[PDB]
Structures are given as structure tokens and as C-alpha cells.
């Protein structure tokens, strides 16, 4: 159909088809006559995965034979989604395949559907990880991705009365055709037991142990031959574990539990001893892989050399003492010379600011689950403040504010300050990010050592983003620019010539209105719910929290709803408003918020003099197979965080590439964002970082807002009264107490600029050829926020190896 | 090599060849650098399954074209041991692959050897159905075997001091290639509740819901294309299950706990609620399969012309009140004409006369569990008793006796009193055990309805238990015979006309040395152990429990070592006694016995006077892949359970079938061995039924023989002054005190008699030609004790279906 999807040549074809009906046969056993549509995408998943096969052994292979630096990605979150289409692209078979099915009697996008996302991630940070895979294959490097295999992703989430309810992601129900168990590199990983001290050095004994089993999935580059992998731990009891009889068998789930569910927790920090068991489960199992792999290349001062471990936050932290733990004890080398190699193999990237956030273990945690690793780290810590002292002589405070242990009610230690002690390298995820690391939060750690600190700003892939997502997209573009931009993403800037093209201007559009009207079907025929395809799509999709400002959209739509019945027959841009995102299951306001969404859509969704001319719809259970869908049918990105609060984004960047216009604030990536489009192609508002900064001094009080501006106090009014909840009259009470009282995020100092610079953007919209020029300036200008611009900066800055945009032999 | 293993044709090793190394290559993800032996197993396992597809799904099809009555055969227990040679066999593949793996350079019998048991039973019953299923294909039937997938097996024995130790059996540890996953015919299964009284009838309402999710697995017929299904059950929770939300995740193992592990007791009854969960959990899930089918063919008048279902001791005889249930409560059948559908439905086999091995559960925990099948069950035992009472008025006696419901300390349901009262046939697995159950435990049943009474002699598969696992053998017997007995095993009568042949007995003879050769080195190489090939080899290998009297063989083995330690210069026939067999956990005198055992072989295997004279083995770790080599290996059968407690023995027919002689009582099976052989080519000794009964009158007291045979005197004086266990004297005081004061099955009384018997074994080797003869004797009139020939029975006395040795088109 489309050029970007490949060639459908006749031999191809031709195999595809007969090798669907080998494995619907041989692997699934069946015929024709018995099987669904769910037994026709495992036979296609077979299919497909069997392509896979060669690159990967060789790929592989190839990495044994030229030895080269290896790059170890640790993360307790793997976004993935679905898998199917991703491999197709990568491997230019989705046109052959699309052939193929539609000739044995089949529709590919019917089947797609019935993928389940791999949701082993949260949001931002598991995305990240996924992004920068993609990026690593695609770009021939060396690269491994390290995690743990839940059982149980994100859950589901059902809204029912409004409210959220949570199930069980049991995401492997069906059998992951994209994994292969590795179960004879299983390795042992300790927990409790004691230390006892000999001539020759500490030893850790009388520990309990949990086996650790891997699981390999592939990650292919594009169209480069190049697989690399991605490997995920599941935990397993030991076969003499507990051994009246049967519950000794029945409590082998204790240790399996382990890697059973992911924490729902973003931006939040919660001191669970099973949190602490997988972050060292993870930690401990890869660095031994890593050893293992390093000595099939006795001397570790080229350990450095041949291994990079990046830490992607804190989440693995333990593997800075873990790493000095099996140097010292197991392997003899003396304290500085183990933490010279540590030092420069670890790296540290930073996602967060939220005071909340950050992890800072109980001491007696540590003590009684990891007795070993406590008395390393409080080595690290005398030995670093000793640096500290000598540098700062005299500076007393400086060393209770730099040190790794936290004194206090508890004791805790500081994982983002061990971090930055046991790394070469130190960045943030986007310039105003990396900036306030410097400046406020990591300033002593800044002084002491500022070559450690560097920026790293985020990027998103192009292949998932935009050629799988969006091809109606990437043909229109690829027909006047060609095809190459798709692994060199900075070719966009050459449809910056096309802004006055009127073919190109029309084309922009038609694909705009197509995904408009793919998913307004969508969201009626699988949610029953009907929209106006002609409206402008005003999008906010996320996870849910207070600093992201949900509530402010909130605000502005109940404006617009309240000057529709104030001024019924006058004129309004038509929108439709949607917003999505899960919030943390114990997260009170969060859940609040959403339940305000659905009341809102209530009252407008059914009030006859709005007619079609609003409409608020909560998207349910967002997620990135959701994200592929709305993302490409969005008018309207909402980044409206308060200022300083949002370390990067991402979302942000997806709405960039696929045609939508962004109404900001000067946070994260939207600043390098309006920087490459110029501000005038933006619509940014609200403080900046220094006017949040002033009014804290100052002291913020929202009754001031309240005082002075009517349309603010009618709102809170209506709220307060019950408008929006009849039967239950104060239902919104705790957020009115919250937004008068309690806002850390300032929601009413923005107010008055948000509803106004929400005006331009309907004036805009009015003129379709001036809102679509503008979107073509956007899209021209994403460019930079690849993730495979990112990797080749990690690359060259932080881990010491080139990028290669060669191919592997076929 | 030899001629039963089929042809090694051209095309065929080629495409075996190919095939193999395709499955390596996309199904294992390996080249031939990296694969260890335990790919090349699985690499192999895939090709043959491969073979399987097209027979499995034609069959299938078969049954739904034609519509044939359906057997469900409803176990606790299938033990299948191993499975890839079993298919070659069957499929007639076995040379192919042989030459196939050695061109590509493999050693096939060392790929089998790494391929775990599937362990899903204990003894006895779990391997009756296994060898039942095999039978059912081979002729022709459209049977299906119903259980549970239980993640842990019976557990691997460890001995350690002596002591059995018990580990963990993780049998799907490296994944099983012989089973298809069904997710989507997952059904619901209820637990707990309340019963509710409408206008309309009962219902069962706010019970807790357990999902079972079916595994199938293949079943192939000997050599006719016909592959049935045995399908096991998982329990899974539902995804709304529990749902802080951590907790909520993790307690989903609740549920699933039903399918986690097999009860390790057999021949004993131990009142576990998780046990009785088991139970339902299969026939709940198993109806409704049954149920559909038949639907898928409104009247149940036709229900028992279309199905019947086989219960397989009392362990699924909740199917009664089940299928009760669904007939009464859910179609709206009235109760006599669901009864009558019931009773011509359902059928019973007992496997025991153990009082202790009585499934007998307490009212209150059917009262919580299961609240309406106890109500069920009430009615059932109402009308029941009326039919008594108009039989035999006025007797009282009789009416507690044979009720359902047991008063006393707890209420109790006898589960095999339901059995007979809701199953047209009731029957025992030999003539003596058949007898006994209608003169002793079922004779107030027996007189009520003496039709439903029969007898069902037990049998083995001569495909595992003499093709498979003595090929040797098999060859010799091929050679002048033909092929035909493998499916027909009553043509061994045509062995008798060669008893003189003297070529025919040197080959015979032959066979067994290089069995015995063969096991000689097996334990020297996985065991460390050095044995005589030369001398006799006595085994006994089952189950250790007291009525099996492993402790009269302890006693004959310290007479031996006794009366060589008495004269060390004069001549006795060398053995070898090999004894076997697992322990239940909790059965603290089989625990003892097995000490007992080793501290034997401490005493006797170390005194240099003995020499290679006297050796006593301990075999660890008894279970089906054992069996296959021992049962070879061995010249005598010691079959000396006390008379009238073995129900009949599948063992004995084992050794019978492969050229070993038979020492033993006239109990259970043996009975109709030696009638079959003639007495005088058995070695019978003991006590009868009748004897055993008089002794109980008069009261057995152990005492008597202690005074009376000085030998006997000698050993327990050893025993109780520590001669076999210097370092702890009174270790074996517990044996000696059940010995002389609380034996019930009377060690001493046959004791005399045994030592006597064993002279005349001995003294029948000394004559190799002569010992011979009568193995010839044996093998020749094993025939009858073909599962072959039991399933008949069952298929033209119980079930109304007729047999076919008719092959499906290939
Ligand atoms: O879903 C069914 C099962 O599939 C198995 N895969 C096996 S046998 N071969 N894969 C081969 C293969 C080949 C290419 C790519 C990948 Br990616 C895997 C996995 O080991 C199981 O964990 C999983 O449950
Ligand atoms: O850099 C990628 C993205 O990372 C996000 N960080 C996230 S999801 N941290 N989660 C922290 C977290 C997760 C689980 C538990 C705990 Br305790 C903290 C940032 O908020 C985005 O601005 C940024 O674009
Ligand atoms: O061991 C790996 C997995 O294999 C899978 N088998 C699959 S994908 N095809 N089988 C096809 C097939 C074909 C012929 C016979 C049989 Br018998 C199965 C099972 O569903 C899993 O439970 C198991 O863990
Ligand atoms: O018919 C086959 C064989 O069956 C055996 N019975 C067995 S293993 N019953 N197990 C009963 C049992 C099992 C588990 C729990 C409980 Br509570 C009882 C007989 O003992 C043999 O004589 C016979 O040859």
C-alpha cells in the first residue's frame, strides 16, 4: 500500500504464507476451521520471530569475536508495549506480511490488536528505557538491557462511577511468544545472613538464597541486521527451599514473590522490604552475568575498558556496593584500587527533583536483608567525607548535608548521594533539568567535583513514533524528502521548504483529519462514546499527579463550560477535551482528580445548550498501544507542569512530531522545544522557574487569586456547592481545601495566562492554513528530540564508544 | 539394529535429520557451538511431537464426525514417566531417529536420560492409568484422561545417614514439550458460598470463583494412528481476585495452590481441606468439559448412551453429587430422572481394604466448602436408606451400616458408600480382592444389588513394559514369533512349543545377563556402587509400607548374613538384594524400615568373611525411568505382602513379563500368575486369606515364634542390642516393639516358611538351565495380564463400547 512499509516481493510472500500455515499447524495445532483470531496472531508472532532468528546468533556472535566495550542498561522498568509491528518495521516486512495475511483471508491491524502491551514500566522513566534500546540496535552498539520479569505489569484500569479500579496485568495469561527462557544461566542471589571477619577479609555466610532465571527477548535495530537483547530475571526458589511437606512446598511463593508485580509508584518513595529484594535481585544477577562475560574475553584494571553500567536513577543503586563487594571479597583486589575500577565503570542518570521521590533506605533494612553491603557503603562514606573535610576544611555543615547516611528519627542512607559517589558520570534529561541539579539540589556534590555533572536531554524513537504509528505521516513526508530521516532524524529541517508548498500544506492536513477520524470511530465502536471529528483535540495524557496539573485543565474547561451558559449563542471554537492516566493506587488526590474529570464530563457531555461545542472525555486506561493511537489524532499537546518540576517529559516530544501544536510552560524539554521552533510556533505561558521562585520567598496565597479574579471564584463556588457532585454535595472538598490552602504546584498563579493563551489557540484554529503552517514549523524542527541523538551522546560523552550506522551482513 | 524398532528408511533419516536441526536452530535459538545435550534432547523431543500433530488432530475429528460413546477416565493420578521413547514406539520411529541422531553425531539412549519424569502419581493407582490410557488408544477407543497438572510430582528421594530425605520435584523446571496449553477453554470452578431456597429450586450463590485452565496432552495408540487426549488442570486466579494493592497481587497464590503439589500418602487417608479442594477443583471442571461436548453433539436421556465416566478409586467421587447438581439444579431435571442419568453414568474401582486408607470427610468442612453437594449428599443417603429399609425391614443394624453419613465424635461421609450407591458397576482389580469386597467391607452392599459387583484383574502395557524398556527381549521373542503379541499378548502361548529349544533358552539367558550387565554398570557409574553381575538378583522395588512386609525381606537377608558368619567356608548361591521405594513424609515407620535397610547394608556389605557372597542395595529414588531398568535387571520378584492386603500388585506382573521368577504369597494378582503359570513354576509361600483369619480368631500373638525359632530369636536380639547400629543401641527399638507386640500383618507367622522357600530359589539357580526353563514358563503364560485384555473388559462389561484394532488412515 504504502512505500515506507517495504517491498512485497513474490518469494516472500509466498514463504510468509506457507510458514503462517506451518506454525498454525505444527506450533499451535490446529486448522483452519478451529482457529480465532488470537490463534492467527500467535501463528503470525511465529511467523515474524523466526526472521529474527539468524541476525540475533550472529549479532551476538559478532560481539564474542571483536570484543568489543560492552553497554549495560540497569533498569527496574521496561516500557515495552507490543512487539508485532515493531519487529515488522525494523525488519521491512510489514508490507510482505500485510500481503500475505490479507491473501490467506486475514486482516494484520485485527490481529495487531490482540497483542498485550509488555507493561513492565510506569511511565516516563520504563519508556525511556524501551526508546533507548531501539536507539542502541539501531545505532551498533554492544548494548544489553537488564531488569526484572513481572509476572504482574501496571494494572489495568476500569473507571466505574467515575472512580478507578485497579486489576491484575496478567500479561503472560497467553504464553510471550517474544521471549526465550534462558534456565541453564540461572544464578544464586543472597539475602540476610551475617557477616563474619577472618585473616583474610569479611565473609558473608548463613544467607538465604533465591535463584535468578533468565529471560532473553530480542531488540532489533533498523534494518540493520543488528539484534541486540534484552534480559529480564525471574526469581525461583532453590529445590531443597523449606525442606510439614506440603507447606514447605506451598512457601516456595515467598521467595517467588520476588519478581511477581511491579510497584505502581512514580514520582513517589515507599521503604517496602520487597522493593528493596528486587532492586537488589536485579543488581546482583546481571553483575554477575557481567563478570561471567568479561572473563570469557584475572587483571580488572581493564574491567573499565570492556564494561559501562548506567543507572537509570537509583533504582539499582546497590550495584555500586554490590560491584566493590565481589572486588574485595571474592576476587582479593585491594579498597582503591576495586573502587577506582567501580568509579569508572558506573554511571548515573537523574529523573526527578520531587523531594518525595528520592529512596532513602532505613539503616536496619540494610542491616538485617544486606549486612555486607551496609558496612561497604559506610566505608564509601567515611572515605568520601574525609575528601569532602579536605577540600572544605572547616565547612562543617557541608559534611552533614554531602553525607550518604541521613541522621535523624531513622537512619537512612541517601541512594542518590551513593550514586553520585560511585560514578564517573552524573546528568540530568533535559538543559533547565541538569541545570537545577547543579545549582540546587546536587550543588554541594557540583562543587566538590564538576566535571561529573553533565546534560543529556531525552529523545523518543521515530520508529515506533512515527513510522509505526503514524504512516499515513511518514509517507506523505518521506514522498518529497525520501527515507533516510528515519534513522537520521535532523533530514526534517528540509520540510521547512515546504511550508509554503499548498500541496504539502493539504496533505499535513488530510493525514490530521484521517487520524482524527480512525480514532473518533475508535473510541465509539470499542468505548461507545461519540465525538465531533471537526473539533479541535485538546489531549493531556499522562500519569496522574499534582505537579503535572490535571487540575488546571480542569479549570480551564469549566471556564469555557461557564461562558458557553453565560453567552449561549455566540461563537466558540468546538473542542473535544480529553485526558488520560493512571493514578498510584494509594495516591488520594490523584484519584480524586480523576473522579473531578468524570464529574465534569457529566454535567458538559449532557448539557443541550453546549450541543456539540464541548466535550470531556477521560481516556481509561492509558498506556503506550493507547498512546500510538491518540497521539497521531491530537490538535492540542498540554505540557503544563509548574515550572521546575518536570525533570524532562516525553509525551511532549511524540504530539511534536505527529502534527500537534503545544500549549506549555518554560518546563523540561518544552524550553529546548520552543527553542528549535521558534517561540512563535509555541504557545508557552505561566511563570518560569525564577517567578516560582519569587512567590515562595514572597509566600504563595491562593486567596489572593480567589480575591481577584470572578471567573476563578465562580469555579471554586461550584465546586464547593456541589454543582458537579448533587447527591454528594461536598465530594470535592479535600481539592478546594487543597487549591486554597495546600498547592505546592500553584495552580491559581497560572490561571489567568493558561485561559488566555488557550483564546490564541482557538483564534488559530479558526484558520486552518495558519494553524497547519505552524505544525509544519513543529514537526520540521523535532528533529533534535530522537533518541537516537541522545544514545550517540551517552555514546561519546558518557560511555566512550562510537555509534555505527553500519549494517551486519544479512 | 533390531527388527521391533522399525524401518530406517532413506527419506525418512534424512527429513529427521533436517528437521532436528531446524528446531535447534528456531526453536531453541542455538547453533551446534553452544547447544548442550539437554537442547539436542529438546530438539529431538520437538521433532517427533511434530509427528503427533496431524494423527492428533484427525482422530479428534474422527470423534466428532462419527460420535462414538465417550470414556472419561477421572484420576488424582497419571504416572506417565517419560515420554519421548514411548512415542517413537508407537509411532514406529524409534530406528529412524536412532540413525538420524548417530549420523549427526549423537548418542540417542543419552539424549532419553536427560528427559524428567512427569512423576503426577505415587504407585500403583497413578501408573494404572497411565498404562490404561495407552491401552485405550491401542484399541481404538474414544477415551479421555482427566486430572490435574500439579507443578510438583511426587518428590526425589535423597538419602542421606541412611535417611530418606525428600526434595522438591520441579518436573516443568526447563518447560515440557509434551503439552499444548488450552487457555481459551478455561472454565470457572466454585468454592465456599451459601445455598439459597427460591420458588424455583436451590441455588448455590456468593461463592468464591477458581479458574481451570486445561493443558492437553497427546496420547498415542501402538502403531494405529490414533492419538487421544489427557487433559490436566491448572488453577489460575481471576483477574478481579482480592482487588493493599501489593497484597491484593500477591495473594493470587491462594487460589492457585489447588494445582501446586501432589499428596505424597498412599494407602492412607489424611483429611487436608486443600486436598478436598483438589477433588472438586478436577470434576467440577472436568463435567462442564463433558457436559459441553455433549451439547455440542437438551435431552439427558441420552446422556449415558453418549458417555461414561470412570472413577478412579473414591478420589473423584464428588462427580456424583456434581453432576447431580448441574442436572437438578442448573438444567431443572427432577431428581429420579437426574439419578437414574447418574447412576448409569458413573462406575467405581477400589483399589484398597485399608480401613486407613477410607476416604471418610468430616461434615463440617463439606458443610463450609462445598455447602450444597452436602445437601445433595443428604438426599441422596435418604432415599438410599429407604430402599434399605423396604429390602430388609426392621433391620436396624443394617441401616447405620450402610449409610452415607457416620455418626460419632465427627460427622462423616464414607465417599465409597456414595460410590456405590450413585454407580452402576463397582469393581475390584483382582478375582481374590473382587471376593473379599463382596464377602468382608461392601457385603451389606453386595446383598442389596448384587449386579453392580464385578471383577477387573489389573494389567500393564506390554508396549513401556517389555518393547521400551527390554528390546532384547522383545527381538528374542520377535524372531520366532512374530510381531504380532505386542498388540496381542495372549500369542506368548506360542513360547511354550520352545521350552526345550535349546537356542531358544541360550538366547533367553543371554538377554537377562546383558540386562543385568548393563544395570551392574549403571550403578558403579550415577551411583558409585560395585555389585557381582553373576549373582542372583533379588529385588523387591514398591512402595514402602508395613503390609508390603519389606521387614520379612530385612529379616531373610540377616538370616543369610547369619548363617554365613556360622560356616564362612561352606557354599551358598551369591544374590544381590536390591529393595527400593519411596516413604509418604509422614509415615514414621516406613521411615524406619528404610533405615533399617541401609544399616543392613552398613554391616553386611563391609564384612570381608561375606566377600561378594552377600550384597544389599538400597535403591534411591524408586519411580517409573527406574523401573524400566531395574525391572530387566532382576531374576527374582519378591511379591510377600501378608495375605489379603495387596488388592492385586502391577509390579508382579512386570517382572513376570521380563524374565524374572517369582517369590510370593497368594495374594492379590499373584493368585492368578501362578494359575496361570501352574503353581510349580512359582515360588508360593504363607499363610491364605483363611489362615491369616483363623490366626486373627484365635489372636496372633508374635511371642510364640520368638520362643520357637532360635534363628528368629538371634535377629531381634541383634536388633534390639544395637548390633546394627553400634553408635545409637536402641535406634530400632520402635521395629522390634511393633514386631513383638503390635504387628497386623503378622511378620513372624510366615516367617519360617519364607526362610525355606528362599533355600528352594537358591538351590533352582545353582541349575542355570533348569532356572531357565521355568522363566520361560513364566514370560510364556504372562499374556493375560495386558492391560490390552483389562480394558476390553472394561469397555464390554462396564462401559457398553467394543474395541477396535482398526487403523485411521495415516
Ligand atoms: O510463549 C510460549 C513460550 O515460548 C518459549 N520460546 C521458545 S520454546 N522458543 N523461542 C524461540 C524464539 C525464536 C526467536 C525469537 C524468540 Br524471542 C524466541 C519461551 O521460552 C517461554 O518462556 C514461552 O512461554
Ligand atoms: O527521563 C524520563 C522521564 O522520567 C520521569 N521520571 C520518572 S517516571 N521517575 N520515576 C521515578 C520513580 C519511579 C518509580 C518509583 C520511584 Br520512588 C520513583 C520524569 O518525571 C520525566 O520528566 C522524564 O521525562
Ligand atoms: O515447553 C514449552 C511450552 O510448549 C507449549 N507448546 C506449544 S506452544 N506448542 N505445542 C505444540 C504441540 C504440538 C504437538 C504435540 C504437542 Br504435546 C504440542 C505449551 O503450551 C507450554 O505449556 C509449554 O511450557
Ligand atoms: O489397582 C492398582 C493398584 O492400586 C494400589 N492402590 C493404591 S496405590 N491406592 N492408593 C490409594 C490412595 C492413594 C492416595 C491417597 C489415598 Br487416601 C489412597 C493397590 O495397593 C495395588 O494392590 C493395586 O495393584
Not at 507493561?119 to 542502541?136: E, K, Q, T, V
Not at 514520582?267 to 529484594?277: D, P, T
Not at 473539533?535 to 480542569?554: G, P, T, W
Request: charged residues 25%; hydrophobic residues 40%.
Amino acid at each position: 500500500q504504502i512505500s515506507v512499509r517495504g517491498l512485497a516481493g513474490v518469494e516472500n510472500v509466498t514463504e510468509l504464507k506457507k510458514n503462517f500455515n506451518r506454525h498454525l499447524h505444527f506450533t499451535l495445532v490446529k486448522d483452519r476451521n478451529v482457529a480465532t483470531p488470537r490463534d492467527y496472531y500467535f501463528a503470525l508472532a511465529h511467523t515474524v520471530r523466526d526472521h529474527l532468528v539468524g541476525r540475533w546468533i550472529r549479532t551476538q556472535q559478532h560481539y564474542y569475536e571483536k570484543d568489543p566495550k560492552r553497554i549495560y542498561y540497569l533498569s527496574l522498568e521496561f516500557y515495552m508495549g507490543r512487539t508485532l509491528q515493531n519487529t515488522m518495521v525494523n525488519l521491512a516486512l510489514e508490507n510482505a506480511c500485510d500481503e500475505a495475511t490479507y491473501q490467506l483471508g486475514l486482516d494484520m491491524e485485527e490481529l495487531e490488536e490482540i497483542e498485550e502491551d509488555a507493561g513492565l514500566g510506569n511511565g516516563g522513566l520504563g519508556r525511556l528505557a524501551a526508546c533507548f534500546l531501539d536507539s542502541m540496535a539501531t545505532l551498533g552498539l554492544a548494548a544489553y538491557g537488564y531488569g526484572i520479569r513481572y509476572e504482574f505489569g501496571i494494572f489495568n484500569q476500569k473507571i466505574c462511577g467515575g472512580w478507578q479500579m485497579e486489576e491484575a496485568d496478567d500479561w503472560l495469561r497467553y504464553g510471550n511468544p517474544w521471549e526465550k527462557a534462558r534456565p541453564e544461566f540461572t544464578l544464586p542471589v543472597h539475602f540476610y545472613g551475617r557477616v563474619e571477619h577472618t585473616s583474610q577479609g569479611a565473609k558473608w555466610v548463613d544467607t538465604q538464597v533465591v535463584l535468578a532465571m533468565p529471560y532473553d527477548t530480542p531488540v532489533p535495530g533498523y534494518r540493520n541486521n543488528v539484534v541486540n537483547t534484552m534480559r529480564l530475571w525471574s526469581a525461583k526458589a532453590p529445590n531443597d527451599f523449606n525442606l510439614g511437606y506440603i507447606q514447605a512446598v506451598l512457601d516456595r511463593n515467598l521467595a517467588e514473590n520476588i519478581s511477581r508485580v511491579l510497584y505502581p509508584n512514580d514520582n513517589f518513595f515507599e521503604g517496602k522490604e520487597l522493593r528493596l529484594k528486587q532492586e537488589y535481585f536485579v543488581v546482583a544477577a546481571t553483575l554477575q552475568d557481567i563478570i561471567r562475560r568479561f572473563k570469557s574475553s584475572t587483571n580488572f584494571d581493564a574491567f573499565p575498558d570492556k564494561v559501562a553500567i548506567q543507572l537509570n536513577d537509583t533504582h539499582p543503586s546497590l550495584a555500586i556496593p554490590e560491584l566493590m563487594r565481589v572486588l574485595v571479597d571474592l576476587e582479593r583486589l585491594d579498597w582503591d584500587k576495586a573502587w577506582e575500577v567501580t568509579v569508572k565503570t558506573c554511571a548515573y542518570t537523574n529523573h526527578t527533583v520531587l523531594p518525595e521521590a528520592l529512596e532513602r533506605w532505613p539503616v536496619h533494612l540494610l542491616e538485617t536483608l544486606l549486612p555486607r553491603h551496609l558496612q561497604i557503603i559506610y566505608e564509601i562514606n567515611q572515605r568520601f567525607l574525609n575528601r569532602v573535610a579536605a577540600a572544605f576544611p572547616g565547612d562543617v555543615d557541608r559534611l552533614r548535608r554531602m553525607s550518604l547516611v541521613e541522621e535523624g528519627a531513622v537512619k537512612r542512607i541517601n541512594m542518590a548521594h551513593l550514586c553520585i559517589a560511585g560514578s564517573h558520570a552524573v546528568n540530568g534529561v533535559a538543559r533547565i533539568h541538569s541545570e537545577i541539579l547543579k545549582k540546587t539540589i546536587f550543588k554541594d556534590f557540583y562543587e566538590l567535583e564538576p566535571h561529573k555533572f553533565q546534560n543529556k536531554t531525552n529523545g523518543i524513537t521515530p520508529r515506533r513514533w512515527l513510522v509505526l504509528c503514524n504512516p499515513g505521516l511518514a509517507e506523505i513526508i518521506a514522498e518529497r524528502i525520501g527515507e533516510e530521516y528515519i534513522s537520521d532524524l535532523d533530514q526534517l529541517r528540509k520540510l521547512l521548504s515546504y511550508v509554503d508548498d499548498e500541496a504539502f500544506i493539504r496533505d499535513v492536513a488530510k493525514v490530521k483529519q484521517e487520524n482524527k477520524l480512525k480514532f473518533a470511530a475508535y473510541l465509539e465502536r470499542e468505548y461507545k462514546v461519540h465525538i465531533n471529528p471537526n473539533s479541535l483535540f485538546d489531549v493531556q495524557v499522562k500519569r496522574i499527579h499534582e505537579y503535572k496539573r490535571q487540575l488546571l485543565n480542569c479549570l480551564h474547561v469549566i471556564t469555557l463550560y461557564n461562558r458557553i451558559k453565560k453567552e449561549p449563542n455566540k461563537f466558540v471554537v468546538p473542542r473535544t477535551v480529553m485526558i488520560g492516566g493512571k493514578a498510584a493506587p494509594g495516591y488520594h488526590m490523584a484519584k480524586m482528580i480523576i473522579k473531578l474529570i468524570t464529574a465534569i464530563g457529566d454535567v458538559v457531555n449532557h448539557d443541550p445548550v453546549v450541543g456539540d461545542r464541548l466535550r470531556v472525555i477521560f481516556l481509561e486506561n492509558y498506556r503506550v498501544s493507547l498512546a500510538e493511537k491518540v497521539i497521531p489524532a491530537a490538535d492540542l499537546s498540554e505540557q503544563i507542569s509548574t515550572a521546575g518540576t518536570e525533570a524532562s517529559g516525553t509525551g511532549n516530544m511524540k504530539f511534536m512530531l505527529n502534527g500537534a501544536l503545544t500549549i506549555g510552560t518554560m518546563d523540561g524539554a518544552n524550553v529546548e522545544m520552543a527553542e528549535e521552533a521558534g517561540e512563535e510556533n509555541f504557545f508557552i505561558f505561566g511563570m518560569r522557574v525564577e517567578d516560582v521562585d519569587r512567590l515562595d520567598q514572597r509566600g504563595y496565597n491562593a486567596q489572593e487569586y480567589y480575591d481577584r479574579i470572578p471567573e476563578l471564584r465562580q469555579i471554586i463556588e461550584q465546586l464547593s456547592s456541589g454543582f458537579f457532585s448533587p447527591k454528594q454535595p461536598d465530594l470535592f472538598k479535600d481539592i478546594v481545601n487543597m487549591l486554597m490552602h495546600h498547592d505546592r504546584f500553584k495552580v491559581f498563579a497560572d490561571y489567568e495566562e493558561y485561559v488566555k493563551c488557550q483564546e490564541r489557540v482557538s483564534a488559530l484554529y479558526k484558520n486552518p492554513r495558519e494553524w497547519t503552517r505552524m505544525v509544519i514549523r513543529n514537526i520540521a524542527t523535532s528533529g533534535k528530540f530522537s533518541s537516537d541523538r541522545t544514545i550517540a551522546q551517552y555514546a561519546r560523552e558518557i560511555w566512550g564508544v562510537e555509534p555505527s550506522r553500519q549494517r551486519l551482513p544479512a
